[PDB]
Design a binder for this molecule. Sequence first.
Ligand SMILES: [C-]#[N+][C@@H]1[C@@H]2c3c([nH]c4ccccc34)C(C)(C)[C@H]2CC[C@@]1(C)CC
Ligand SMILES: O=C(O)CCC(=O)C(=O)O
Ligand SMILES: [Fe+2]
Length: 267
Amino acid sequence: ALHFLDINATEVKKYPTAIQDIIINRSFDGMIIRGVFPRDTMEQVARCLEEGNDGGMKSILNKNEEFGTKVAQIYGHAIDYFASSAIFRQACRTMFQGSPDFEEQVESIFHSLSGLPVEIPTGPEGQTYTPATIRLLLEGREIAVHVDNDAANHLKTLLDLSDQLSYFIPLTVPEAGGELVVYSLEWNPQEASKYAQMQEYMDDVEFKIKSNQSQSVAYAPGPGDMLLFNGGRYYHRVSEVIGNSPRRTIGGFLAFSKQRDKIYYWS
Ligand SMILES: [C-]#[N+][C@@H]1[C@@H]2c3c([nH]c4ccccc34)C(C)(C)[C@H]2CC[C@@]1(C)CC
Ligand SMILES: O=C(O)CCC(=O)C(=O)O
Ligand SMILES: [Fe+2]
C-alpha cells in the first residue's frame, strides 16, 4: 500500500507535520508539491547549463562513463566532496539569481512542512555539505531501480531518527519517459542476508519487480514541481528518457537531527 499527497506549493502550510507523518508515523509515503519554483526560473537555470554560463558548474560534472546507461551524469560529488560542494552552492546561487534562491526557497518548503529549523549539514571544522546535486538523463538513459539506504560518517552524528526522505525538482523534463516509478517493495536487511552478494539480491529484487508482485506508483513532475518521498524505505527507479530533450533534476536527501530539533538536507 503506497499513499501520496498532491498539493500546490501554496498549500504547504496546511501540512505542518508532513515530514513527521512520512518518516516517524509512516501514515503516508510521499507527496508532490506543484510549482515550488517558477517555470521562468527553471528555464532560466536550464539555459545557463545548456549555454555554458553556469557559474563554473561544468567543472564539477561527473559523466559516469563506465557505468553505462542506467546511471545519470551528475553535477557535484554525491555521497574531494567538500570542494565540489562549495563550487555547486556558488554556481547554483549564480543561476537562480535569487528569483527565488534555491536554498532559501527549498528550506522554506521543508520548514512549512515540519515547523523545525532547516540547515545544510556541516563538516568537522565548518565545511559545508552540498545541499543538492543536478542529475542529467539524456535520451536512452535511465536510473536503475534502487533504495537510498545507509564518508561513513560525520552526518550520522547529526541525524538518524530514522528514515531518510528523497527530494527533487525538475529543471527540464523529457518528451516521454523520465518517470519516477516507486515500488511497494521495501529495503529489508533480512532478505538481503539470504544472498551471498548484492548482485544476487538485486537480481531477485528485479525479478520481484518484473513479476509485478509489488504495487507501483509513477510520477512525472513538471518543471518546478517538487517530489518528496521515502526513498530510503522503498525501491524506485527513473524510467528511460524518450526524445532529444534531457531530464534535468536538482535533488538530494533530508532527515531529522539526532534530537529531532532540526531538519538537515544535503546530497
Ligand atoms: C544516478 N545516480 C546516483 C546513483 C548511482 C548509482 N550507481 C552509480 C554509479 C556511479 C555513480 C552514481 C551512481 C545508483 C543507481 C545507486 C544511483 C541512484 C541515484 C543517484 C543520483 C544517487 C546519488
Ligand atoms: O531523478 C532524480 O533526480 C533522483 C530520483 C531518485 O532516485 C531520488 O530522488 O531518490
Ligand atoms: Fe533514489
